[PDB]
Short mmCIF file of all heavy atoms in Angstrom, two decimals:
data_model
loop_
_atom_site.label_atom_id
_atom_site.label_comp_id
_atom_site.label_asym_id
_atom_site.label_seq_id
_atom_site.Cartn_x
_atom_site.Cartn_y
_atom_site.Cartn_z
N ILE I 1 53.41 154.80 67.31
CA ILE I 1 53.95 153.46 67.07
C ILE I 1 52.88 152.48 67.48
O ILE I 1 52.39 151.70 66.67
CB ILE I 1 55.28 153.19 67.83
CG1 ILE I 1 56.34 154.20 67.44
CG2 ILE I 1 55.75 151.76 67.59
CD1 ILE I 1 56.60 154.31 65.94
N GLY I 2 52.51 152.51 68.75
CA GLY I 2 51.41 151.69 69.25
C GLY I 2 51.60 150.21 68.97
O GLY I 2 52.62 149.61 69.30
N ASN I 3 50.60 149.62 68.31
CA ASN I 3 50.61 148.17 68.08
C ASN I 3 51.43 147.81 66.83
O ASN I 3 51.47 146.63 66.41
CB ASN I 3 49.18 147.61 67.99
CG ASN I 3 48.40 147.74 69.31
OD1 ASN I 3 49.01 147.98 70.36
ND2 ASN I 3 47.14 147.39 69.29
N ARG I 4 52.10 148.80 66.22
CA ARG I 4 53.03 148.54 65.13
C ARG I 4 54.36 147.91 65.62
O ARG I 4 55.11 147.42 64.81
CB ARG I 4 53.34 149.84 64.39
CG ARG I 4 52.12 150.50 63.75
CD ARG I 4 52.39 151.99 63.49
NE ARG I 4 53.36 152.18 62.44
CZ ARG I 4 54.01 153.32 62.19
NH1 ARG I 4 53.83 154.40 62.94
NH2 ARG I 4 54.89 153.37 61.20
N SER I 5 54.63 147.99 66.93
CA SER I 5 55.80 147.37 67.54
C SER I 5 55.50 145.91 67.87
O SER I 5 54.39 145.59 68.30
CB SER I 5 56.20 148.13 68.82
OG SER I 5 57.14 147.37 69.59
N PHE I 6 56.48 145.03 67.63
CA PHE I 6 56.36 143.62 67.96
C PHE I 6 56.13 143.37 69.45
O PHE I 6 55.30 142.58 69.82
CB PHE I 6 57.61 142.82 67.56
CG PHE I 6 57.76 142.58 66.09
CD1 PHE I 6 58.76 143.22 65.36
CD2 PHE I 6 56.96 141.66 65.44
CE1 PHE I 6 58.94 142.97 64.01
CE2 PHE I 6 57.13 141.40 64.09
CZ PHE I 6 58.11 142.08 63.37
N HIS I 7 56.90 144.04 70.30
CA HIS I 7 57.04 143.61 71.71
C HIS I 7 57.84 144.66 72.47
O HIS I 7 58.52 145.50 71.87
CB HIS I 7 57.78 142.25 71.77
CG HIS I 7 57.50 141.42 72.99
ND1 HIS I 7 58.13 141.61 74.20
CD2 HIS I 7 56.70 140.34 73.18
CE1 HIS I 7 57.71 140.73 75.08
NE2 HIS I 7 56.84 139.94 74.48
N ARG I 8 57.75 144.61 73.80
CA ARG I 8 58.60 145.41 74.69
C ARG I 8 60.08 144.96 74.65
O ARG I 8 60.97 145.77 74.76
CB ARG I 8 58.09 145.31 76.15
CG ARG I 8 58.87 146.19 77.13
CD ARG I 8 58.50 145.92 78.59
NE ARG I 8 59.18 146.83 79.52
CZ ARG I 8 58.71 148.02 79.94
NH1 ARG I 8 57.54 148.52 79.53
NH2 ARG I 8 59.45 148.72 80.81
N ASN I 9 60.31 143.67 74.51
CA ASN I 9 61.60 143.06 74.81
C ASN I 9 62.46 143.04 73.53
O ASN I 9 62.05 142.47 72.53
CB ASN I 9 61.44 141.65 75.35
CG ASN I 9 62.72 141.09 75.94
OD1 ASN I 9 63.63 140.68 75.23
ND2 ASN I 9 62.78 141.03 77.25
N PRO I 10 63.66 143.64 73.59
CA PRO I 10 64.54 143.69 72.41
C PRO I 10 64.83 142.34 71.76
O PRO I 10 64.92 142.25 70.53
CB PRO I 10 65.82 144.35 72.93
CG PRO I 10 65.72 144.36 74.42
CD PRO I 10 64.26 144.36 74.74
N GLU I 11 64.95 141.29 72.56
CA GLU I 11 65.20 139.94 72.03
C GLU I 11 64.03 139.43 71.20
O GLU I 11 64.23 138.85 70.13
CB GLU I 11 65.50 138.93 73.15
CG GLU I 11 66.15 137.65 72.62
CD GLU I 11 66.10 136.48 73.57
OE1 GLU I 11 66.28 136.69 74.81
OE2 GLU I 11 65.88 135.35 73.06
N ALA I 12 62.82 139.63 71.70
CA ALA I 12 61.61 139.26 70.95
C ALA I 12 61.52 140.07 69.64
O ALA I 12 61.25 139.52 68.59
CB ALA I 12 60.35 139.44 71.79
N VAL I 13 61.77 141.37 69.73
CA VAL I 13 61.71 142.24 68.54
C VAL I 13 62.71 141.77 67.50
O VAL I 13 62.35 141.53 66.34
CB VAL I 13 61.93 143.72 68.90
CG1 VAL I 13 62.10 144.58 67.65
CG2 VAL I 13 60.76 144.24 69.74
N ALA I 14 63.97 141.61 67.93
CA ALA I 14 65.05 141.17 67.04
C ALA I 14 64.69 139.88 66.35
O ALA I 14 64.78 139.78 65.14
CB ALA I 14 66.35 141.03 67.81
N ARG I 15 64.24 138.90 67.12
CA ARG I 15 63.97 137.57 66.55
C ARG I 15 62.73 137.53 65.68
O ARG I 15 62.72 136.83 64.66
CB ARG I 15 63.95 136.49 67.64
CG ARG I 15 65.33 136.32 68.26
CD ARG I 15 65.33 135.36 69.39
NE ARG I 15 64.64 134.08 69.18
CZ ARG I 15 64.42 133.18 70.15
NH1 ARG I 15 64.87 133.36 71.39
NH2 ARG I 15 63.77 132.05 69.88
N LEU I 16 61.69 138.27 66.07
CA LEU I 16 60.48 138.33 65.23
C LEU I 16 60.79 139.07 63.91
O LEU I 16 60.38 138.64 62.84
CB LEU I 16 59.33 138.97 65.98
CG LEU I 16 58.80 138.10 67.14
CD1 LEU I 16 57.84 138.85 68.07
CD2 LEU I 16 58.11 136.88 66.63
N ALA I 17 61.57 140.15 64.01
CA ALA I 17 61.98 140.91 62.83
C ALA I 17 62.83 140.06 61.87
O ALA I 17 62.58 140.07 60.67
CB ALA I 17 62.75 142.15 63.24
N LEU I 18 63.80 139.31 62.40
CA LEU I 18 64.61 138.40 61.57
C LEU I 18 63.77 137.36 60.86
O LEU I 18 63.99 137.09 59.67
CB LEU I 18 65.67 137.66 62.39
CG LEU I 18 66.86 138.49 62.86
CD1 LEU I 18 67.69 137.68 63.85
CD2 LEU I 18 67.72 138.93 61.69
N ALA I 19 62.80 136.79 61.56
CA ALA I 19 61.91 135.82 60.94
C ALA I 19 61.03 136.49 59.87
O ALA I 19 60.81 135.92 58.79
CB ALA I 19 61.04 135.14 61.99
N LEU I 20 60.52 137.68 60.16
CA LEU I 20 59.74 138.42 59.15
C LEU I 20 60.62 138.68 57.92
O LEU I 20 60.19 138.46 56.80
CB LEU I 20 59.21 139.75 59.70
CG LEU I 20 58.24 140.46 58.76
CD1 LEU I 20 56.79 140.06 59.01
CD2 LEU I 20 58.34 141.96 58.87
N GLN I 21 61.85 139.14 58.17
CA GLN I 21 62.81 139.40 57.10
C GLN I 21 63.02 138.22 56.16
O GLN I 21 63.02 138.39 54.92
CB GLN I 21 64.16 139.84 57.70
CG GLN I 21 65.30 140.03 56.70
CD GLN I 21 66.44 140.76 57.31
OE1 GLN I 21 66.52 141.96 57.16
NE2 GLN I 21 67.29 140.04 58.05
N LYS I 22 63.17 137.01 56.73
CA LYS I 22 63.32 135.80 55.90
C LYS I 22 62.09 135.56 55.06
O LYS I 22 62.20 135.20 53.88
CB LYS I 22 63.62 134.57 56.76
CG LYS I 22 65.01 134.59 57.38
CD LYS I 22 65.17 133.43 58.36
CE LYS I 22 66.50 133.47 59.08
NZ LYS I 22 66.37 132.72 60.37
N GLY I 23 60.91 135.78 55.64
CA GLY I 23 59.66 135.71 54.90
C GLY I 23 59.58 136.72 53.74
O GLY I 23 59.20 136.36 52.62
N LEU I 24 59.94 137.97 54.03
CA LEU I 24 59.97 139.01 53.00
C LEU I 24 60.85 138.61 51.82
O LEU I 24 60.46 138.80 50.67
CB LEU I 24 60.49 140.35 53.59
CG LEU I 24 59.59 141.06 54.63
CD1 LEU I 24 60.32 142.23 55.20
CD2 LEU I 24 58.28 141.51 54.05
N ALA I 25 62.02 138.02 52.11
CA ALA I 25 62.95 137.57 51.05
C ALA I 25 62.37 136.47 50.16
O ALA I 25 62.58 136.49 48.94
CB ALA I 25 64.28 137.14 51.65
N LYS I 26 61.61 135.54 50.73
CA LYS I 26 60.88 134.55 49.93
C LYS I 26 59.87 135.19 48.97
O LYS I 26 59.63 134.66 47.88
CB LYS I 26 60.16 133.51 50.80
CG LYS I 26 61.12 132.54 51.49
CD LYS I 26 60.41 131.29 51.98
CE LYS I 26 61.27 130.50 52.95
NZ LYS I 26 60.46 129.54 53.75
N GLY I 27 59.30 136.33 49.38
CA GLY I 27 58.43 137.12 48.51
C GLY I 27 59.14 138.09 47.58
O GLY I 27 58.50 138.85 46.85
N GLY I 28 60.47 138.07 47.60
CA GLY I 28 61.28 138.88 46.69
C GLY I 28 61.79 140.19 47.24
O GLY I 28 62.46 140.93 46.52
N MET I 29 61.52 140.48 48.51
CA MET I 29 61.78 141.81 49.05
C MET I 29 62.88 141.83 50.10
O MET I 29 63.04 140.90 50.89
CB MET I 29 60.52 142.39 49.66
CG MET I 29 59.42 142.61 48.66
SD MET I 29 58.04 143.58 49.33
CE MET I 29 57.16 143.85 47.79
N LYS I 30 63.58 142.95 50.13
CA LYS I 30 64.44 143.28 51.24
C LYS I 30 63.62 143.88 52.39
O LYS I 30 62.39 143.98 52.31
CB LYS I 30 65.50 144.26 50.76
CG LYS I 30 66.33 143.75 49.55
CD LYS I 30 67.10 142.52 50.02
CE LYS I 30 68.13 142.06 48.99
NZ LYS I 30 67.60 141.83 47.65
N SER I 31 64.30 144.19 53.49
CA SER I 31 63.62 144.80 54.64
C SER I 31 64.16 146.21 54.89
O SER I 31 65.33 146.50 54.54
CB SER I 31 63.86 143.95 55.87
OG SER I 31 65.23 144.04 56.28
N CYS I 32 63.31 147.04 55.50
CA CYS I 32 63.68 148.37 55.95
C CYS I 32 63.31 148.57 57.41
O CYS I 32 62.13 148.73 57.74
CB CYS I 32 62.98 149.43 55.09
SG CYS I 32 63.42 151.13 55.59
N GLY I 33 64.32 148.56 58.29
CA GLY I 33 64.11 148.73 59.72
C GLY I 33 63.79 150.18 60.09
O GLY I 33 64.42 151.09 59.60
N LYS I 34 62.83 150.38 60.97
CA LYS I 34 62.53 151.73 61.42
C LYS I 34 62.09 151.76 62.87
O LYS I 34 61.64 150.73 63.38
CB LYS I 34 61.50 152.36 60.47
CG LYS I 34 60.21 151.62 60.31
CD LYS I 34 59.47 152.05 59.04
CE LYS I 34 57.98 151.70 59.14
NZ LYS I 34 57.18 152.04 57.96
N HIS I 35 62.26 152.87 63.59
CA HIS I 35 62.80 154.13 63.14
C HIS I 35 64.07 154.38 63.94
O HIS I 35 64.02 154.63 65.14
CB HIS I 35 61.79 155.26 63.38
CG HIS I 35 60.45 155.01 62.77
ND1 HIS I 35 59.55 154.12 63.32
CD2 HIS I 35 59.88 155.49 61.64
CE1 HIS I 35 58.46 154.09 62.56
NE2 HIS I 35 58.64 154.92 61.54
N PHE I 36 65.22 154.25 63.28
CA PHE I 36 66.53 154.26 63.94
C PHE I 36 66.80 155.59 64.64
O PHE I 36 66.59 156.63 64.03
CB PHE I 36 67.62 153.98 62.90
CG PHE I 36 69.01 154.08 63.43
CD1 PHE I 36 69.62 152.97 63.98
CD2 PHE I 36 69.70 155.28 63.40
CE1 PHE I 36 70.90 153.04 64.48
CE2 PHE I 36 70.98 155.35 63.90
CZ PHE I 36 71.59 154.23 64.44
N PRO I 37 67.26 155.61 65.89
CA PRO I 37 67.74 154.47 66.68
C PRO I 37 66.69 153.88 67.66
O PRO I 37 67.07 153.08 68.52
CB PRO I 37 68.87 155.11 67.48
CG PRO I 37 68.34 156.48 67.79
CD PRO I 37 67.67 156.89 66.50
N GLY I 38 65.43 154.28 67.52
CA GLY I 38 64.35 153.74 68.35
C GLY I 38 63.37 154.82 68.73
O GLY I 38 63.70 155.74 69.46
N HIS I 39 62.15 154.68 68.24
CA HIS I 39 61.07 155.65 68.45
C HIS I 39 60.14 155.25 69.61
O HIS I 39 59.19 155.98 69.92
CB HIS I 39 60.27 155.74 67.15
CG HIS I 39 59.53 157.03 66.94
ND1 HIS I 39 58.61 157.51 67.84
CD2 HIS I 39 59.52 157.89 65.90
CE1 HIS I 39 58.09 158.63 67.37
NE2 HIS I 39 58.63 158.88 66.20
N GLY I 40 60.39 154.11 70.23
CA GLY I 40 59.49 153.51 71.18
C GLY I 40 59.34 154.18 72.53
O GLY I 40 58.32 154.00 73.19
N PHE I 41 60.35 154.93 72.97
CA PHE I 41 60.40 155.46 74.34
C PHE I 41 59.72 156.81 74.49
O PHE I 41 59.21 157.12 75.55
CB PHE I 41 61.85 155.54 74.87
CG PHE I 41 61.92 155.83 76.34
CD1 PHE I 41 61.72 154.81 77.27
CD2 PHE I 41 62.13 157.12 76.81
CE1 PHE I 41 61.77 155.07 78.64
CE2 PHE I 41 62.18 157.39 78.17
CZ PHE I 41 62.00 156.37 79.09
N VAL I 42 59.74 157.61 73.44
CA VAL I 42 59.13 158.93 73.49
C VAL I 42 57.61 158.86 73.42
O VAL I 42 57.06 157.86 73.01
CB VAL I 42 59.60 159.81 72.31
CG1 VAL I 42 61.08 160.13 72.44
CG2 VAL I 42 59.31 159.14 70.99
N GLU I 43 56.95 159.92 73.83
CA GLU I 43 55.51 159.96 73.73
C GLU I 43 55.21 160.60 72.39
O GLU I 43 55.96 161.45 71.93
CB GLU I 43 54.89 160.75 74.87
CG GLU I 43 54.94 160.03 76.20
CD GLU I 43 54.44 160.87 77.35
OE1 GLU I 43 55.17 161.76 77.79
OE2 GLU I 43 53.32 160.62 77.81
#
């Protein structure tokens, strides 16, 4: 995952992702969240 993650903090991730999502929609695209339910904690 590394630097592909927005941030440590779930609030920052959620809000940055929502803003990115709105941007994607202006470009015609939907979003695909990954990797459910969270790949960040494992090595």
Side-chain angles (χ1 to χ4, degrees):
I1 302 306
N3 295 344
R4 299 159 70 196
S5 167
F6 286 110
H7 205 278
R8 184 189 184 91
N9 192 283
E11 196 197 321
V13 170
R15 293 176 47 188
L16 292 168
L18 287 171
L20 188 90
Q21 174 166 265
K22 289 173 185 156
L24 293 173
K26 289 198 194 162
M29 296 191 170
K30 304 296 189 306
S31 70
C32 181
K34 57 199 200 182
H35 305 75
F36 175 89
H39 205 303
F41 191 79
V42 294
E43 287 175 285

